[PDB]
Amino acid sequence: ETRMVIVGKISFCPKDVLGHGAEGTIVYKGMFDNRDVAVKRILPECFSFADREVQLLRESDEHPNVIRYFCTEKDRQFQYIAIELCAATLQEYVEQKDFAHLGLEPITLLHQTTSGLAHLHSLNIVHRDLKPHNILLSMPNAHGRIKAMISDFGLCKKLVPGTEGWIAPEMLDNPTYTVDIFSAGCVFYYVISEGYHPFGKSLQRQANILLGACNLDCFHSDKHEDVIARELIEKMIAMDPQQRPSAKHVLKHPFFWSLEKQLQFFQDVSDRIEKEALDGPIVRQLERGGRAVVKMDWRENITVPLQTDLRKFRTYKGGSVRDLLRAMRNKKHHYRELPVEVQETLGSIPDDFVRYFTSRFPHLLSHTYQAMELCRHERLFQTYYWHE
Amino acid sequence: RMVIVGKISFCPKDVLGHGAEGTIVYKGMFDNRDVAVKRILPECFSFADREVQLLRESDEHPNVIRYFCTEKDRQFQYIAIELCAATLQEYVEQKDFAHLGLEPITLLHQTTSGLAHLHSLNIVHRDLKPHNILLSMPNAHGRIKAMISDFGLCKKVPGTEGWIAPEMLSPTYTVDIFSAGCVFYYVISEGYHPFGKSLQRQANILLGACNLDCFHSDKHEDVIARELIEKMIAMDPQQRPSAKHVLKHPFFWSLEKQLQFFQDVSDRIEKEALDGPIVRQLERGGRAVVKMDWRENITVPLQTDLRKFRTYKGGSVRDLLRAMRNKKHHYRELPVEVQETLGSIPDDFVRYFTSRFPHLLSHTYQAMELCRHERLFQTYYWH
Ligand SMILES: Nc1ncnc2c1ncn2[C@@H]1O[C@H](COP(=O)(O)OP(=O)(O)O)[C@@H](O)[C@H]1O
Ligand SMILES: Nc1ncnc2c1ncn2[C@@H]1O[C@H](COP(=O)(O)OP(=O)(O)O)[C@@H](O)[C@H]1O
Ligand SMILES: *Cc1c(O)c(OC)cc2c(C)c(CCOCCOC)c(=O)oc12
Ligand SMILES: *Cc1c(O)c(OC)cc2c(C)c(CCOCCOC)c(=O)oc12
Ligand SMILES: [Mg+2]
Ligand SMILES: [Mg+2]
């Protein structure tokens, strides 16, 4: 009637449905040792479990962003999987007007997703089906902190994977991390714009994925974060799979950087450029985009107090990017000995100081990161770039 | 080396921090739940058992902390209260605190409504401050909350250097309200005191020196806060607003509530003459807030589209208000280009305007008091 289903260890009352999956799949709320879990029952005729991959996940350290499959058991006609019981899917996070994000903010969230995914790829495993619904939010712990974990991995298909809208194009063989990095890109933009898809509406989505149409209409060219984000997503959702950035690669990116990390970068650059010829390849590179970034003369687009105190020292070109970079490194390093007025059109440090400049020079950070490869090694830049 | 005095019991070692005048506060146990207990010298503070009983005979308030029980030993007094996680001090000051969680405005709303609970019963706090405002522990499912504390006791001058109302040096609800203002600015400024450093604080309070240096005038929200804060902390006791009076203020309004007002006005002003006091009043500050002509300070599609009708001035606040009430009420029929520069609604649509007209909301709220008593405006105003 409405009697409980065992197939122990797993157990669940069949009225406790959490939601339907694709091909006659269903997910209920159940029980395990005695802790709650969610049990998902897949028709062995529709989906194919990859037990070896998981046996591989267990015998390698746990990642806090890749969900745990507790056990699995078979009844005569069904496959039952017990997994960490979660509270919601990205979908609600983004789209539920009143969802209570709690602690975590979109960028950390994406940092978590991408980190977990990177771990999966570290074990030569490809998810093949990322999307808001396969990226889940934990319930709150004792300390109340909530996190995010990717799911429904290693759970393939028999008699094409993925979901209309999120399918890397080149899948229309044995896939490769490039696919998942496409799906990632989409979710990234989905989260940031607060619901919009880059491709960009249910019905046209896959068609437009095939054609290569993007939108990205939310990313303006005058905002620092919009620029740094677009620079990445545009590259993740790239039509050419061999252009899509590696997993860890996406993790070093400027996009995730603290304000402190940002400003710290800005400086660390400057300290190289002194004692480097301007005819030189490095500075010539840093000045290629030049004027556009600096708005012709950067002195004309900052505060009057700051141009006065700078004035008192000259040796700041103003159409020059490098001079804008040391100008920062100095106004910063001598910060304590500054006039007060000047201390307060910026300040304090690092957050307000950096934001001053990136607010005025949206293309600054992006441009500077892109310029300052060539120092992929240096022994020192390994914190901002990846050398391998 | 455990200490009983049941039903309260605590380890003397589990200390949570020293309070005033010799007070010490430990982590103990009550029924079998964890609690905080504080031991006071009966000789230095005076508990008020009548006040607490009264609060206890009354419906709980979620933002006013609970006293479970109290017990005297030969030489001390011990008090058992809900065990909280930290004070407003840490919330503001601790670079990595995990907030987690909850926004400053609802935080101050919470503190205020509790306060108003206290004043509902004719009971005044007298020593409000960050250290006397606590953050609950994460609950069953991870939501944090803020409650006031250390009330109902006294001293055998009340308050703390930095937070005492001016007239208490040389009481009524006005005193708390001042301390409240102080905290509001402390919290919004992320650390700064209005008066505004430990030593010059009380002095300056007597003198009247403020700062509010963090409130620009070009930001809708700063203008809103400042306009209220400055009034909480006002030198004159008769000027400081009622407790729940402060709960009705725009400072706490949702985007949607802000917008609903904007509109709820236009629908009032319309179909009345300009000789009428109301309109003439609304344009008192006029040109400056609309920026001479607001038509020149809005987005391009929107003027292009608002060209097609006007009949719209640009030196008229009422015409900018009407504008919002039309462009919103027809949002559906707008040209997509236009629908896209604002929207969705209410949030993005109301910020379109308040981003560019910082004094717009403030200005209108003031002018429109004239209709304080009307059925439609009680949700916005106080009596
Ligand atoms: N760990 C979980 N906790 C709660 N609900 C879940 C969990 N995992 C999956 N679900 C629910 O089941 C629905 C569909 O199941 P499934 O086939 O696993 O995913 P999808 O919808 O991604 O294809 C999901 O949208 C989700 O609401
Ligand atoms: N309910 C409580 N839970 C946990 N700690 C508390 C509680 N009440 C007070 N404290 C701690 O006690 C310390 C001071 O004791 P108290 O009597 O409040 O003096 P003060 O008024 O300076 O806070 C505070 O710093 C706070 O950490
Ligand atoms: C603004 C500024 C710049 O740009 C700079 O460039 C190297 C240096 C300094 C220094 C060293 C100080 C410290 C005070 O030195 C004063 C003596 O100068 C004649 C500063 O305040 O600002 C800069
Ligand atoms: C923008 C706008 C304004 O300002 C306005 O003020 C009177 C009215 C309208 C209306 C009525 C509509 C609906 C479309 O009407 C076109 C003419 O037919 C009545 C609108 O889209 O925008 C405004
Ligand atoms: Mg799923
Ligand atoms: Mg206290």
Swiss-Prot record, chain B:
Q: Where is the KEN domain?
A: 255-383
**Expression (tissue specificity):** Expressed in liver (at protein level). Ubiquitously expressed. High levels in thymus, liver and lung. In the brain, preferentially expressed in cortical, hippocampal and olfactory neurons.
| Protein's name according to its UniProt entry | Serine/threonine-protein kinase/endoribonuclease IRE1
Site: Interacts with hydroxy-aryl-aldehyde inhibitors. Where? Answer: 312
Ranges in the topological domain labelled Cytoplasmic: 1-383
Subunit composition and interactions:
Monomer. Homodimer; disulfide-linked; homodimerization takes place in response to endoplasmic reticulum stress and promotes activation of the kinase and endoribonuclease activities. Dimer formation is driven by hydrophobic interactions within the N-terminal luminal domains and stabilized by disulfide bridges. Interacts (via the luminal region) with DNAJB9/ERdj4; interaction takes place in unstressed cells and promotes recruitment of HSPA5/BiP.
List the source organism: Mus musculus
All copies of domain Protein kinase, residue ranges:
10-252
Task: Tell me which residues this entry annotates as catalytic.
Answer: 127 (proton acceptor)
For this chain, the family text in UniProt reads: Belongs to the protein kinase superfamily. Ser/Thr protein kinase family.
Binding-site residues for ATP, renumbered to this chain: 16-24, 38, 82-84, 129-132, 150
PTM note says: Autophosphorylated following homodimerization. Autophosphorylation promotes activation of the endoribonuclease domain.
Instruction: Tell me what effect the entry lists for residue 326 to A.
Output: Abolishes endoribonuclease activity
Q: Where in the cell is it found?
A: Endoplasmic reticulum membrane
User: Which domain of life does the protein's organism represent?
Assistant: Eukaryota
The UniProt annotation puts the region (Interacts with hydroxy-aryl-aldehyde inhibitors) at 326-327
Q: What does this protein do?
A: Serine/threonine-protein kinase and endoribonuclease that acts as a key sensor for the endoplasmic reticulum unfolded protein response (UPR). In unstressed cells, the endoplasmic reticulum luminal domain is maintained in its inactive monomeric state by binding to the endoplasmic reticulum chaperone HSPA5/BiP. Accumulation of misfolded protein in the endoplasmic reticulum causes release of HSPA5/BiP, allowing the luminal domain to homodimerize, promoting autophosphorylation of the kinase domain and subsequent activation of the endoribonuclease activity.
